[PDB]
Ligand binder design. Structure first.
Ligand SMILES: C[C@@H]1O[C@@H](O[C@@H]2[C@@H](O[C@H]3O[C@H](CO)[C@H](O)[C@H](O)[C@H]3O)[C@@H](O)[C@@H](CO)O[C@H]2O)[C@@H](O)[C@H](O)[C@@H]1O
Ligand SMILES: C[C@@H]1O[C@@H](O[C@@H]2[C@@H](O[C@H]3O[C@H](CO)[C@H](O)[C@H](O)[C@H]3O)[C@@H](O)[C@@H](CO)O[C@H]2O)[C@@H](O)[C@H](O)[C@@H]1O
Ligand SMILES: OC[C@H]1O[C@H](O[C@@H]2[C@@H](O)[C@@H](O)O[C@H](CO)[C@@H]2O)[C@H](O)[C@@H](O)[C@H]1O
Ligand SMILES: OC[C@H]1O[C@H](O[C@@H]2[C@@H](O)[C@@H](O)O[C@H](CO)[C@@H]2O)[C@H](O)[C@@H](O)[C@H]1O
Ligand SMILES: OC[C@H]1O[C@H](O[C@@H]2[C@@H](O)[C@@H](O)O[C@H](CO)[C@@H]2O)[C@H](O)[C@@H](O)[C@H]1O
Ligand SMILES: OC[C@H]1O[C@H](O[C@@H]2[C@@H](O)[C@@H](O)O[C@H](CO)[C@@H]2O)[C@H](O)[C@@H](O)[C@H]1O
Ligand SMILES: C[C@@H]1O[C@@H](O)[C@@H](O)[C@H](O)[C@@H]1O
Ligand SMILES: C[C@@H]1O[C@@H](O)[C@@H](O)[C@H](O)[C@@H]1O
Ligand SMILES: C[C@@H]1O[C@@H](O)[C@@H](O)[C@H](O)[C@@H]1O
Ligand SMILES: C[C@@H]1O[C@@H](O)[C@@H](O)[C@H](O)[C@@H]1O
Ligand SMILES: [Ca+2]
Ligand SMILES: [Ca+2]
Ligand SMILES: [Ca+2]
Ligand SMILES: [Ca+2]
Ligand SMILES: [Cl-]
Ligand SMILES: [Cl-]
Ligand SMILES: [Cl-]
Ligand SMILES: [Cl-]
Lengths: 292, 292
């Protein structure tokens, strides 16, 4: 079962992602195949998959940027029927916006079936060009046809996953306590994490004893990532990953406040120094408290 | 012994405060008597008293706004010698900027003696007018003369004091843990706390599930108060009081994130709801974690 989360959905035959054209929130905006850049935010190509209660392997798919939903036009089972962005809600009963998502016969990619029509999401002709039509099409669950197979590249972590990555880290103090604030988090490439840091004004901030010292830099970075998230995305039901940590050095006589993010494989944390933009596997401190 | 801290220093004969004229950072800016408004930030009238190591009852006095120091002009013991703001440092050995501060014979107000000259800070003639000269003057430790007596009205809390106020509160969960970030904090009137909230843009922020929910409002308020502190005051060695709390309701099935401040008498906390600007003695939650 596909987990609740944010996905970049990539065709299995050609390197085209499921893209809501121009990120537009208009009803009837085409969903199309489009090329992508790895290790970036692909602004029109992120999809929040929300499981429907008691309806096995079935989801709404909400574009993270537009807040509108993947919609099979009038629910038609006719092959070639347009797939578009359309207004909706996370737990809608409109079958046009409900999608059963299960592993394909290659066991890695998925097929995406409309719950009402029983047709599948199809990159028409396998066309690799930017703006290629995606449509609902006749098919089967087991066939090999790559036009209807899709890698769900997971871009978020659950809170349990984030906690797991922290608990793997060797620089955690014995007295550590962690405070979880949300449920599901977009993990940022470092290029983006750094951009938010730059755009916050923190690179220009001077360290000043107590009035703007390490704890202020760290809390300000976290607030800047929270503001970026709300100002950047129209969908709801997720947060952006940026932690704050307090830590103590090995001698026990100095403490520090700093940020952390997650590795690209989502398995480990990496520390960020908000006073200079540096990423570190070892910041010189063991964390006694985190919130994220 | 006067404690390290921030003080509003008020003459004992007439309701004039020790005021650095126009808040100016220029060397030789006059320090004068001036009227004040209670329960406000008196922008030119706050003084950070820093104890000198191993020199009993002796301090520098740093104006919070200008970052310059109370200075007896050329250290002269002549009565009438100007007291002005002047560049310096917190632990200076320049006796012009060193002040022995001890209780007067009324046991409540203090006298302020220059360490080099042995003369006292004097509101000349007891003049109550705005801009009245303050000078160094001959005197004694024990006399009653109100021209040389000063109420040190304490405007900050230590971290121990803040912790004490939290521990007095009845809405603290059994599992509570508190994380202290700084050492000495300016306590804000609510009028100012509210102003910072308004100026942060938070009153216009919409609640959104996970992406801008209670935890984001609370962290954003705290960051806005930290930015205000640095952008507002030139002195260093103190912070501004604004806490974040996470709490749980009595049924144990809902949690919330919010802010808190201190009462005017510095003895108790008051909760602030950053989603609507309200102050509450009981927010409906018991705090399991705080940072401040
Ligand atoms: C927000 C916008 O994003 C980029 O343009 C999108 C575009 O993005 C994809 O394709 C480009 C090449 O055209 C790169 O591979 C990106 O890595 C992709 O994410 C598509 O999403 C189309 C169609 O919806 O819309 C464009 O706006 C970027 O090129 C823009 O400068 C801008 O940052
Ligand atoms: C920053 C500035 O503050 C106020 O003017 C100060 C003034 O403030 C004191 O006296 C006024 C009346 O003149 C009120 O009692 C205030 O409550 C006091 O804090 C003095 O500090 C003088 C001399 O240094 O400078 C003025 O700038 C206020 O009146 C201004 O509007 C402004 O907010
Ligand atoms: O058009 C507004 C509606 O949009 C969604 O439903 C429609 C559906 O009623 C039908 O017109 O088909 C279109 C295209 O397939 C949409 O699925 C919402 O689910 C409705 O609540 C309503 O907003
Ligand atoms: O047209 C019927 C078939 O449709 C699906 O496959 C085709 C594929 O063979 C190629 O013609 O391209 C189109 C559009 O891209 C479809 O992917 C089913 O997968 C086949 O089983 C059959 O129904
Ligand atoms: O003028 C710059 C200096 O200011 C302070 O000391 C002077 C002192 O040397 C003498 O000129 O008297 C004036 C007025 O009383 C000041 O106290 C600093 O302490 C010096 O470091 C220097 O900056
Ligand atoms: O002038 C000598 C006295 O100075 C101090 O008192 C005077 C006070 O009597 C009145 O004259 O006003 C001036 C300026 O405000 C001084 O406060 C000492 O307190 C006296 O003991 C005596 O030295
Ligand atoms: C079938 C269509 O689906 C959607 C609804 O908004 C319309 O009212 C109609 O029900
Ligand atoms: C290219 C096409 O892919 C699909 C198959 O059903 C057709 O037979 C053809 O192979
Ligand atoms: C007495 C004066 O005090 C201060 C110093 O900056 C000057 O150099 C001089 O020492
Ligand atoms: C008003 C003055 O205050 C001071 C005293 O030393 C003087 O005698 C006079 O009383
Ligand atoms: Ca939350
Ligand atoms: Ca601080
Ligand atoms: Ca600190
Ligand atoms: Ca949140
Ligand atoms: Cl096949
Ligand atoms: Cl096939
Ligand atoms: Cl007397
Ligand atoms: Cl007297």
């Amino acid at each position: 079962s596909l987990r609740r989360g944010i996905y970049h959905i990539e065709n299995a035959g050609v390197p085209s992602a499921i893209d809501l054209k121009d990120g537009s929130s208009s009803d009837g905006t085409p969903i199309v195949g489009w090329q992508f850049t790895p290790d970036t935010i692909n602004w029109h190509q992120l999809w929040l998959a929300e499981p429907i209660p008691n309806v096995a392997d079935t989801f709404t798919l909400c574009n993270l940027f537009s807040g509108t939903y993947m919609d099979l036009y009038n629910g038609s089972s006719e092959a070639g029927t347009a797939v578009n962005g359309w207004q909706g809600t996370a737990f809608t009963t409109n079958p046009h916006q409900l999608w059963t998502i299960k592993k394909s016969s290659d066991g890695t990619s998925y097929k995406i079936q409309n719950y009402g029509s029983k047709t599948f999401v199809d990159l028409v002709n396998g066309d690799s060009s930017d703006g290629a039509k995606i449509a609902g099409w006749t098919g089967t669950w087991d066939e090999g046809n790559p036009h209807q197979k899709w890698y769900f590249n997971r871009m978020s972590v659950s809170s349990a996953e984030a906690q797991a990555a922290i608990a793997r880290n060797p620089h955690i103090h014995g007295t550590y306590r962690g405070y979880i604030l949300d449920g599901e988090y977009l993990v940022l490439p470092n290029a983006t994490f750094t951009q938010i840091w730059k755009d916050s004004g923190l690179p220009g901030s001077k360290w000043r004893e107590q009035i703007y010292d390490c704890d202020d830099f760290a809390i300000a970075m976290k607030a800047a990532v929270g503001k970026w998230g709300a100002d950047s995305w129209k969908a709801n039901g997720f947060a952006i990953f940026c932690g704050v940590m307090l830590g103590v050095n090995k001698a026990g006589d100095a403490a520090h406040a700093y940020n952390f993010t997650l590795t690209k494989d989502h398995a480990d944390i990496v520390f960020f120094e908000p006073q200079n933009g540096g990423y570190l596997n070892d910041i010189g401190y063991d964390s006694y408290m985190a919130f994220y």
